[PDB]
Amino acid sequence: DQSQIIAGFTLWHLSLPVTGAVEVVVLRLQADSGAVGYGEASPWVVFTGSVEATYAALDRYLRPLVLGRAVGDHAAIMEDARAAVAHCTEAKAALDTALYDLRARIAGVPVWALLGGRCRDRIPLSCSIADPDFDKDLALMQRLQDDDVRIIKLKTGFKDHAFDMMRLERLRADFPAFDIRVDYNQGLHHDVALARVRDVATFKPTFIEQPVKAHLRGLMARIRDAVDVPLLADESIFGPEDMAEHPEIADGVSIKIMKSGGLTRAQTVARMAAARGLSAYGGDMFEAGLAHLAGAHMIAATPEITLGCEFYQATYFLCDDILAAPFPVADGHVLVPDTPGLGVDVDEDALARFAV
Amino acid sequence: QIIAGFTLWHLSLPVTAVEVVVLRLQADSGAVGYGEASPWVVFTGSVEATYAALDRYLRPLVLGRAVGDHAAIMEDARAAVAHCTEAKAALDTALYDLRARIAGVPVWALLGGRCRDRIPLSCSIADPDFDKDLALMQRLQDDDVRIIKLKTGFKDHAFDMMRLERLRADFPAFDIRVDYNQGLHHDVALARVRDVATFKPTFIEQPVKAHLRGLMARIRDAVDVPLLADESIFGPEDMAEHPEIADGVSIKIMKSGGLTRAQTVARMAAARGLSAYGGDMFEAGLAHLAGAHMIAATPEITLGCEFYQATYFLCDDILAAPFPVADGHVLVPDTPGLGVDVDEDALARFAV
Amino acid sequence: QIIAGFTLWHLSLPVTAVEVVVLRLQADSGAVGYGEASPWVVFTGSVEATYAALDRYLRPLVLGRAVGDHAAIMEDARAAVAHCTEAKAALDTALYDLRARIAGVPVWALLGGRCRDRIPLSCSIADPDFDKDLALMQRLQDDDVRIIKLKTGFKDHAFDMMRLERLRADFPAFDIRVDYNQGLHHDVALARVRDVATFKPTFIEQPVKAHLRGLMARIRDAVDVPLLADESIFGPEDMAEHPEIADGVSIKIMKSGGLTRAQTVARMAAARGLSAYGGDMFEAGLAHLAGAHMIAATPEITLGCEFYQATYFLCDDILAAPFPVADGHVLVPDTPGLGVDVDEDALARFAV
Amino acid sequence: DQSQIIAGFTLWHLSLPVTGAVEVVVLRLQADSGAVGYGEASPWVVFTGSVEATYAALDRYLRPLVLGRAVGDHAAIMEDARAAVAHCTEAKAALDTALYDLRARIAGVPVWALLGGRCRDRIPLSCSIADPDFDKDLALMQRLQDDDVRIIKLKTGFKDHAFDMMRLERLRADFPAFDIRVDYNQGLHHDVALARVRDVATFKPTFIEQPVKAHLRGLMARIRDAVDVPLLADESIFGPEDMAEHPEIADGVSIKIMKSGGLTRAQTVARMAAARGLSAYGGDMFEAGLAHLAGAHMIAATPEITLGCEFYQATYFLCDDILAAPFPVADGHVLVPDTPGLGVDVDEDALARFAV
Ligand SMILES: [K+]
Ligand SMILES: [K+]
Ligand SMILES: [K+]
Ligand SMILES: [K+]
Ligand SMILES: [Mg+2]
Ligand SMILES: [Mg+2]
Ligand SMILES: [Mg+2]
Ligand SMILES: [Mg+2]
């Protein structure tokens, strides 16, 4: 049964409205038996690559390498997948996710059971605070507080520095029970980055994420050493190779299956970080509930990821998701399913509704 | 469902004796999984240390746990008892075997799926009577085995140089590696490594004591032939701490404390262009199968494996059918669990 | 004056097929400029990624801009879309071609003026049938070409060593370089590089995967023959980050994302005594001309160029007259723009 | 037309009175067609070399390498120029400037169009505050404020430390809207440099420039790491070779065509700095409007230079300039011309009036 072939390979390019729209690609794999598995690719054109690049990677270059293969050859399929097309880590993540979802459903086990088993069944949730209209986010904070969410990440550097400092002050004043992180999304020019980081460090955020452009890894290392607050690398480190090459550039790493090109490789990044005493955090892209579930299963199997996750978009940002039931969140945590595969069905009618 | 039973055997296994410890785990449903710990007292620690790790300290953290909590159980296991990586490997192996059998999948399906169904086999050449080993070689050659690892530095340097010349002369189709097992004193290690390197072995493994990692790094940089670390690197933490001491690493589940961690060492090595080889201890077939499933799911381990003891060294194994080898390769099973039944009668027979 | 038009062709070009994307930019006045993107899916990214970069993401940042704002446009282009350095090179090339034609100057007059009017040419030797390549060599020798780059590591090591010995024997007047295209596994890379170094190629290019830069640095320091980085270094940021991984760099506009940035890589290399070579991808004559004008204005690129595909590899090119080569050199034009007309009929003919 | 020869090579050694005098050398190149281009060399004897060295470099050693060459061979002329005479980067800059001005005027394009095109058409201006009579500079500050200049650089270390601290205090008090930088011009002895730098850092200047002697690059690196305020290298880094050799000695670099030996090389220094996250600033020497225009065109084509420029001398320091019209400044910015060549004509009658 482990040599049953992959007989179907189907793509949807979606546009999903948000409270704007975000574009993702969904992959379904179908085995010889008729069993199916799904994966999501969630690109950001300025950071990981375009949606068109990811679609083409799947449609033209991965498809002929996947169709007709033995589904048990998952590990060899993914080595071939990495060799076949440069970049498109999001596309690779979709493939890895669909292969895990498929083999898990065939076996009748949850995806985490294929990643080493479970160390946790809940994962603390962080919501991002990113609105240029801060009164709208103050409204959101009331809802988060009532929902028992107790972590947020302030997106900083996109308006001006006074806007960042104003929001940090007000959130610390009005919402002291919250654990607050900061994410610059590569948004500080090297002229001002250290000074701005030192200023926001005065509010003692749990971490400050990726202040400078991804390639400025030497400057990241300098900022790490200059400031007491933990520095987190995001766009500076995609996968194990980057982690190996740049061991000392930050105090921790944001783990995203869309950067690492899948679930197995995300685990490897987090294990490499932990082995030297670097923190690991469950980051995400502009994703839907399918990609969220993939990340949640990965985190459930990875004790090294201890800083929570930001799988908030399906619950708080997307007008409608693509799952058949609500992405599972209660009491400020993601609830990791224990039913087969990713644990919540993909709604193909929603795939059809949102297809471009 | 919960782990309802936890059973240990301390075995003594005659050879052509080695002591191992076998663990059986039993779920609520009656399903079972097995693992083997294979300690070497001078290297990984005593068999008594390993037995006590399992019997006293791990037993209570494992009995009554949900089998699905495998990852948490192993975190707890690492925190519960220092060393005894062999014990921890036995537990990891049993947990994978048990979960794979409950699910009806081979253990490699729990480790990422498969990248290879066959692994090239190496047999060790370590007899003080070299004529016997020359007989062994003919059998290896008839068996289509095409890799050997010469154990060096236990007699004298002339004995090692003699054997290398003879083997290159009379068996030129063999891929030859060298393993010193920490046996060269620092006074002479560089000189002797340079001498054996003239036979271009594929690698030279662990010339000096495990803790002499600065010297390992010097030997790495002095000689063109790849240097392989063994005892100097156990798990991911050692790999993270000592990134440049060698050109590659011997991956052993008994050093890494399990299957998952062994994968992580190989991946960490590969990420920087260091090689990975499927090493082993004085193990029986149960251990061999655990290592075989690990290698089957780990593309980074490209240098073969040395799972030769169940075939050429043990009088009798503890599996119900032979450990699967043919045409000089280990044949990775695709049936459920580790893929060959453990023979509980063989367990009773060889229990101390 | 403003950029009033932005047009793309996705081409498939038969070879003795490769896909490229051509961009035409059109100013208010009707003046036009062209650029080529030549992607390699395993190396720089897909042709689809490049087409989308231009069609969706760059088009709106370019249409309606003042042509004189070239430097700002390219800043915006780099910020707008990750990767797709081939797309960005096509845009840079079109912007230079258009501005040079508006001004009535060759593109090299926009890049610092000229330091050379001729560039030594290298042709690649990459046929699995070596007898065919031995025929190709006679033609190269009759054409006064005196540099070749042997593509290695795609068959086996004996095939590479065989070809080197034969070429040194039968064609001793040729400057021979070697290119592995990331093709040596880390298990064997040092050994094989050392072996091919015995033929003293002028350089050995990119033996290992692009990300294995620590290993590149080790190979650099282990072997006397110059090591050339290709895929390991794309633009100035990579050059700044990895200063000591090689003895020199292959400069390609399709990696650097343009003409200016390619100059900057060469200058950064030269400042510390690293060499620079005029590399290329599977390009047509438009790309060749962009690279040729770049090299003409960049004294630091002293190792020749490999703009051989339009002459010896493509069945038909997309220029209205032949890409200019004579006496084993590229002949840098001094007429306006890139210096040879793009044939829009050839564009229509080969569009997918 | 690109092979038309350089047929004329003419030098003037000027002395230009200032609110003292400054000595510069002007070069005019004349092509076969009669078109002309001009460049300026602006030496400082203690820093870059004497005016006599620069004059001789042009008159005896560069002249025979330039006369009769094809003007299109600009890049080869400048390689030959660098090989021909040691030092005299100012002389080399004059030659590079005149070649660009000449080819630009022949082509009918502005100089920046020969340097990659334009990224900005205005450049924020900084004026230096360097008078031993501080009341005179307080007068100047009223004029700067009314002129909408909002950057100054305080020259420090030439009187005593209390004088520096007094001026910083008063400027921060009376002119809070100004961005203030500090420049020591190599003026701190190594015995006291760190302590003095730490003291002036308390006023949070945007950068502190070259506290110690140029060769003390190890001590510069120590000062960089000891103080939060950005350290700028000036005399420690001339061109790309220095930049390559000394990558970590400061947080940024002052780019001056008179150090880099021309416009192309200045751009290369700024691109090398930016590639690793080091700042770049448009510095100058005691220059006239010709050299200012050269630097302004260079900066217009170089997005990496983001800290402004100090092309203030033609407007605020020289009693009379050598251009046919006022060096273009409005609203606190240099206005980069878009007409051919450097964009403002050189007044040869002014060359004659000021010749020694
Ligand atoms: K820190
Ligand atoms: K070695
Ligand atoms: K070398
Ligand atoms: K500093
Ligand atoms: Mg982030
Ligand atoms: Mg060993
Ligand atoms: Mg190449
Ligand atoms: Mg200065």
Shape of chain A: globular
Describe the sheet with the most strands of chain A.
Answer: 7 strands, parallel
Indicate the radius of gyration of chain A in whole angstroms. 20 Å
Order of helices and strands of chain A: EEEHHHEEHEHEHEHEHEHHEHHEEH
| CATH architectural group of the largest domain in chain A | Alpha-Beta Barrel
Instruction: Estimate percent helicity of chain A.
Output: 25-40%
CATH superfamily of the largest domain in chain A: Enolase-like C-terminal domain
Report strand order across the widest sheet of chain A: 5-6-7-8-9-10-11
In total, the number of domains of chain A comes to 2
Q: Given the structure, what is the number of helices of chain A? A: 13
Oligomer: part of a larger assembly
Bound molecules: potassium ion, magnesium ion
Q: CATH top level of the largest domain in chain A?
A: Alpha Beta
| Alpha-carbon distance between the two ends of chain A | 36 Å
The total beta strand count of chain A reads 13
PDB class: isomerase
Keywords: structural genomics, isomerase, PSI-2, Protein Structure Initiative, New York SGX Research Center for Structural Genomics, nysgxrc
Entry title: Crystal structure of muconate cycloisomerase from Jannaschia sp.
Chains A, B, C, D: Muconate cycloisomerase
